[PDB]
Amino acid sequence: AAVILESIFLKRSQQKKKTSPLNFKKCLFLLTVHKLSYYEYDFERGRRGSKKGSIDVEKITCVETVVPEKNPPPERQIPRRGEMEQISIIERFPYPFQVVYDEGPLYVFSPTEELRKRWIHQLKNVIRYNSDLVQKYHPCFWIDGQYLCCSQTAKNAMGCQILE
Ligand SMILES: [Mg+2]
Ligand SMILES: [Zn+2]
């Protein structure tokens, strides 16, 4: 329908094995009242490329922040306390959040706190009247076959922490 949000974020890809490396991908994210989708970004023409994936807003169960990595690469280092910068806002994505649905959590990294806050508020908005909304979540990432919060090995494992 109408695009509520358009952003370039770092997305962690669907992990292939517990001993296969983590691929991060810079993607164009669109949010409508109906769909949340990622596209390839045509940087040269300044537009969205092929549609990489779409999640029906109704199948979303949860949206929150994630506890950030302990030793992130410079690409995801959270800067010290205290305007925009054209380069750093498409090169540094330090601020993670998770979109939980039927097939586990999708991890997205925002270049700013403000852009992450904006995305979480708007998604919480469009999912409010969902049937399957959950009251528990994993505050930490699912890394190398387990949640780092509760060592649970199922991806769609019940959240180890209750939402406040
Ligand atoms: Mg445009
Ligand atoms: Zn957990």
DSSP for 47-63, please give it. Answer: EEEEEEEEEEGGG--EE
Resolution of the PDB structure in angstroms? 2.0
Residue 35 CA, ligand 1 centroid: distance in Å:
18
Three-class DSSP category at 40: strand
Residue 157 CA, ligand 2 centroid: distance in Å:
8
Residue type, 11: K
Residue 55 CA, ligand 1 centroid: distance in Å:
21
Residue 100 CA, ligand 2 centroid: distance in Å:
13
Taking alpha carbons only, the member of 143, 83, 75 closest to residue 110 is 75
HSE of 51 in the Cβ direction (CA atoms, 13 Å)? 7
How far apart (Å, rounded) are the C-alpha atoms in residues 78 and 75? 9
CA distances from 8 to 21, 22, 80, 127 (A): 22, 19, 22, 22
Residue 27 CA, ligand 1 centroid: distance in Å:
14
User: Experimentally, how was this structure solved?
Assistant: X-ray
Taking alpha carbons only, the member of 143, 124, 140 closest to residue 20 is 143
Domain boundaries along the sequence of the chain: 1-164
